[PDB]
Amino acid sequence: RRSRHCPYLDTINRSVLDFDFEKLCSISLSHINAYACLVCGKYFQGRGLKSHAYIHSVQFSHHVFLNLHTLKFYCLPDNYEIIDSSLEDITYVLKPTFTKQQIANLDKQAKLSRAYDGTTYLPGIVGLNNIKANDYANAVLQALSNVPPLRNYFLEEDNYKNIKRPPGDIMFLLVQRFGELMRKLWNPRNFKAHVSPHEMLQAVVLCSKKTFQITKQGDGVDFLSWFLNALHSALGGTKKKKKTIVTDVFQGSMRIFTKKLPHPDLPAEEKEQLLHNDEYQETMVESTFMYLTLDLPTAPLYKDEKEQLIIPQVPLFNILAKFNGITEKEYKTYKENFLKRFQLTKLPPYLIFCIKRFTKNNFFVEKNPTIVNFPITNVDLREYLSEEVQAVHKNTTYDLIANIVHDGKPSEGSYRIHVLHHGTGKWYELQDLQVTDILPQMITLSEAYIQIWKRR
Amino acid sequence: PKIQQQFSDLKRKLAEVTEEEWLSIPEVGDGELDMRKIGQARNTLMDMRLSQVSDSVSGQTVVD
């Protein structure tokens, strides 16, 4: 009755509405029947008289509240639900829902999405606030959200709402919180120009047993591996369904034709005995390589005639050729010389490579500064694939989609992400909360740590 | 790792040096990445932009 004629609706402060943090009441501290205030900014509980919301509305004169679950704008002091379609922006920002077709037009991103504040922006290129030392997790999240597979999967709540997870499990929050962050980071009409990873980072901290917290920064490669494993174990529900969205979009098959060496301190006869008695035999132990740890070579620690810059460069093809069948690698296992050799059996649609640029010395932990001369336009791994199914993989022209570089000293270091945005062609480099523009030639200059390439 | 163990892997392969190799050791008394190219290009662009800005100055003096 009183709807569509609410005078109090003309006092909502859109600028102060930030629905990123936890959805709890101001005084009640209860997550049930919450109702945020569209004027007072904060969120209270209840939707009627004798409830905290009515008291907060009467006392502070803030006479417009929206229920965080019912998604309806109501005049709490008068208990008269309002009806105004001009307020749909608040509901969209609170609950970002992507249409069936809008979740596929992400490549048709032409117009820049201007936030409700005074800042034009583009969806996907958004900063996650660096709450203490959250740089590694923020970078990993902003890079994983770039992949259209994962972004599309997390942009549809139906794809994960009906997952049969055990009732007494907390890991399901990671699959639920990451979806909210992915949806918010792709909002075309977000009230602000950035999204806070507070909820997702807190969930990650809780669901990791005091590992990769927001207080002390962690390794980007380790954080990415842990997040991928948690998403793969959380996407599946009440079964061993290995065909998860993450497992299908970023996990491939590698066939490690590995072997071992008999002994370094043995004569020809004793070595040949183990070489023939299957004690130094070659075996195929093909596994699922979700991340290919392409190891960079250690810096020579010596100058030369060439290389006016004293930073030892290295080509990507030589770096990635180690995983090929021909290139053999040795593992210094206990009381054995595990001389192995890998071979990529099957390539994932979005290969994720993480170059281990940091190692541990005999008395410290140094970071290798060698640069990875990786062309960021076109590349093919068919020159390093397995000969058995070389022609089986029709598509092999992979292009890098996102690079995360950890600049600075190992102890005190910053984690910057250089991501190649779709829609346009600019490969923007994003800080914790600063979005800049990076030249494509400059992308291959900064020492990359984790890279994700699309196979096209 | 023992100091010996440290150089153990090298010492094992070090025996492969031939007699000529172990006797020719002299007395100690006697495409590609162009890293500087991008830096030079950026510096030139910045200098050109500044000079364009500096071309709008009013009374900058110069003694030949």
Added chain:
Amino acid sequence: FEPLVRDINLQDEDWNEFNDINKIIIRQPIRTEYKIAFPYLYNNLPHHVHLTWYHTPNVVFIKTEDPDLPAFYFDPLINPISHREPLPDDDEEFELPEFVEPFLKDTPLYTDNTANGIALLWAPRPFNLRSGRTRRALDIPLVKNWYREHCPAGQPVKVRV
């Protein structure tokens, strides 16, 4: 003893909103006893603080003082009981068989060892039990219970130390 975990100085915190002295109402100073008794309520960060058992009911056992007195007798120490029931009348036929008697009619309500036996119920552990294993001579400290109890009143500083 020396602190298990190093404790920062008082000045390490600077008038925090929950640490402002100008807001705490002071009635009595919380001594170390009042903190060691309720560690979880009167000690911030009580890491590895073993709780203590609440008061067990008082053992109101009137110890004997004279063997002449009977075993189960109302001693003067026990406070007197003030003697101030819809009992059915005897007009009915509630008659018991001639063989009905109390179970221990022949057994007396007191005995020579009865009072002494009831005394051993409340006693130091070796006296409390009636069957034990012969422990080692060195493994039987005859003075541990004295030290464990509170120090005697008016003792010199050396004895207290």
Added chain:
Amino acid sequence: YYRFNTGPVGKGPGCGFWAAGWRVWLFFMRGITPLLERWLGNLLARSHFDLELRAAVMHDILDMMPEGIKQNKARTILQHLSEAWRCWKANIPWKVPGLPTPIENMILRYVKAKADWWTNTAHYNRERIRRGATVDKTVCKKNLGRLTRLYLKAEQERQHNYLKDGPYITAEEAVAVYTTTVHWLESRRFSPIPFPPLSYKHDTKLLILALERLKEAYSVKSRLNQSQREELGLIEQAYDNPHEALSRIKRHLLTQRAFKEVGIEFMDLYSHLVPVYDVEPLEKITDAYLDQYLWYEADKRRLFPPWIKPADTEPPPLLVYKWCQGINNLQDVWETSEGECNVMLESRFEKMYEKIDLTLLNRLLRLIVDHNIADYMTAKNNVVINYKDMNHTNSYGIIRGLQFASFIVQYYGLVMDLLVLGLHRASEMAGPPQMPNDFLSFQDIATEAAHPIRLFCRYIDRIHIFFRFTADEARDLIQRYLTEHPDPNNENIVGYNNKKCWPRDARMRLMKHDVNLGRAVFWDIKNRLPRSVTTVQWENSFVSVYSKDNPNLLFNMCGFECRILPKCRTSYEEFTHKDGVWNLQNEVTKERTAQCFLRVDDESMQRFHNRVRQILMASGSTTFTKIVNKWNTALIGLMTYFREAVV
């Protein structure tokens, strides 16, 4: 005793209760028995990683080497290893093409192990020295040498990365900064300082002053080096023919755009190592003449602004005293009744000297200094830093050793201040061009309250801005900071920097509004100056606020940790004029409106303790009179600088 000896049995020797002691000694014997039994049975039967690694490598090479080559080539292999070690310690490549590949691999592995061990040892020794461990002169010398070599290698790597990564400052940001500086100069109408004319009126005076200032460094010592002797001879020759010396200086300035190698040594400060760059003698003379001329021209033309603090007019302690006096001189500088809060942010430009773009410096100085002179100064800023066997180039950092650093650093600081303070605020603080305002003074009382920024003193690489934010302004700034950086867990106060020197009663008190407003002011100051040029870190800085919940406004200027406590909050506390206290009265009423309690900053005390420790340790064979003179000089400096605060 105290239990048994009671009643009729008094003190005596008859106590025969020995079970407890018997048990204790039986337990002690049972515990001791295994050790003594093992000893008796055994009786009756029948930090240095460098030397160790070198010995291991030598043993491995010798055992691998044949007997036909181990007669004399072992010394050759040792010499090759020594050459490899000295090569990695000076960035000089070790190239032995005539050596076996396995031998080269072993040498490289040994060099890497020794480098890691040396780096770890140097880091540990530097940490121990900073903490205050007990060392000697040899250990201190070795640690200083290793630290200097490591710093030189790190600086070479940083310069190489800067060349590889290009200029950090973007073109758009640089253009905007240049436009702002040009607008500021045009508003100030600063006439550029031309090249020194052929008949400058005060050329002889400036040359003599520069020669005197350069000669004063060469104190009468036991002897002087050959380079020092040549420098003294050149100084004498300049003092002999001033006209010819000035002509040579002008010729070098107009032509010598490629100087020689400038040496680099590190002063053995216990806490903060600092470099000592020595320019070439003729180059040093030319630089000193240029610096004196530029300083005189800037003073004549009023190039440097008043808020640039270090000057001859006010010594640093007087600068702190003047800042304290002028803080209370602002209208209603303490009236928190209306909810107003005043925040004085103390910050420093981290790596300001190191992160100075040479190209930007050349493009900016040309707007003020003579174009030829600016180009000469920019070229001099680029040199080959030479130290022992290590030589590296410089492209992204101004050399502090050059005599022209003062003018260059002053111009860079002025540009940074104009960026931070803003165009309108800087104009109001410098007054009209016709009648410029004095230091820490506004042209009018209305112009003092025209913006939150009220007082600001741009010291050398150390900023300090006093902002009197109104209640509405403080609320708006807090809202903006929360919008751009929300902290719903109330974690803003988890990192606020308070002064542990002052007691807990006088410190910032870390309130809810106070901490948030301080963080907002720090962010707004940091968000003004671009991070590409120079960024004031939120950790090493300090934002202190005074409000209804914070009664004391604490500041740390010129190494004197002060704490102004207004009398409005210092009531019921009589004034006892101790030496440490500094009664800061009013301006018009002349009454004591506050009391600026002062104390020596902990950094100054640490520096004094380090100097005393160095003097005691580096005494050595010096006579007791020399040590006494050094101690007297240190004490005189400490007492004369912190005249009052020392009590």
Added chain:
Amino acid sequence: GVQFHAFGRVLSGTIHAGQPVKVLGENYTLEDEEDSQICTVGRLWISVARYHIEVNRVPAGNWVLIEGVDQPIVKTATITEPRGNEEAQIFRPLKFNTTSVIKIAVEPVNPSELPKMLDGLRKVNKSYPSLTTKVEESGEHVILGTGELYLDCVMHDLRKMYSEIDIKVADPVVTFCETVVETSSLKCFAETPNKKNKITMIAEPLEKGLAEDIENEVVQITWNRKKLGEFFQTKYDWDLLAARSIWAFGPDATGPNILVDDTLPSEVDKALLGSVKDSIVQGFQWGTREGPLCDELIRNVKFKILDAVVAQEPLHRGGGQIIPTARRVVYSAFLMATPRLMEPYYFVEVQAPADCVSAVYTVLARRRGHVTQDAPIPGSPLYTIKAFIPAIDSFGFETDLRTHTQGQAFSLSVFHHWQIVPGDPLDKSIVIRPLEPQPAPHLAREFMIKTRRRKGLSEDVSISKFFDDP
């Protein structure tokens, strides 16, 4: 410690595993069913002590430990049948024996883990029935509690079972309550915004015993007009006309405040006042719940609306304007009449040997508490000394009593009643100290100031704070 298993007995029906239920919350009224949460109960066990036994269904009468309805079950709830029984009510909320008066602010040592601590606080609030938790305007995480060992157990569960982080707990305090002593100083004329309405209320302390009669539910306003009027005119000796104009019951349903419609019919229309009667009652309840002095519940008062001006249109009269005006008028009335803070006094029954009763009396002397009655236990040598020590200074009293008696005396506590603070709350002539206990006469002003500082409210509450003229 992650999931919660609600426990109750089926009054009817048969709850079975996997059944969809409609768990009506503690405030799921019939008019506003918004508190309902349709859930799917499942996997319920039987009520065993140390090893629960599962079951498929639960017949009406047995005690069922459901598993899944815990999401909306904060304190107490009644599980109903969805799609049916549309005319249903929620079982009445629990009425506890005693009232919680102790308050303790808690904050994490590391503010990073605040969400974990607040989640644990919500869980422990659900666990303990009488536990009350809230966040005040000062941001403190105050949690109530009956005594001392109660709160010790609450913390030993909060910091070690639910939220494994370390939490810092402030010094325990006592939830003070406001109270008026004298009558209203003058008539307070409070007006609603836009000046459409002008209410007026005169405050007066309630007759002795009537507060304890209302709080004991003896005088139930739920009864009809006749019974309440008789119980007020006879027991309370109120005028037969005055007792026939009651409006509400102060802060709660059973509250120590009485709202009386003392409007003269010659000046105020009964129907027009009734049009604002609901708003006036809501405002009075909110004010009595809040309090004008230290933001605390006001007890033992009888606020009477002397008169009121009411506009015609509901747009101008009532709605969102009468309630704030009502709260302002209530605060002004409770402040104009000479107020006084009240503190909880906890009855303590120390059972000690008669040889040590003197030490028990000596211990209670230093806590501003009188030994009400001493008496020996019939048949037992140990006497049972009974006292009433104020709760404010009663923190740690058990440890002192059991320490001064060498561990031969134990005592308990329960909030028997409330007493007025010795001093005056609105006394600006009394100084305070940061670490020196205020003397006996300087307690009320110190209590008021320290409460308004801890709660973060304005440090000054003058008689002309909420008044219309200022």
Added chain:
Amino acid sequence: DKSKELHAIKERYLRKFVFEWDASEDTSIDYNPLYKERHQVQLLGRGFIAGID
């Protein structure tokens, strides 16, 4: 005592083979009288401590 009690309240708010343990290392110096002079354990007039006469 009283001054000591106030100081304690404020505080709460904010080689050589030594044979005999010196009295400095002793405890039980309590400002409060209730925790300093406490009623002894009188065992109902029929018991006492051990060892003493």
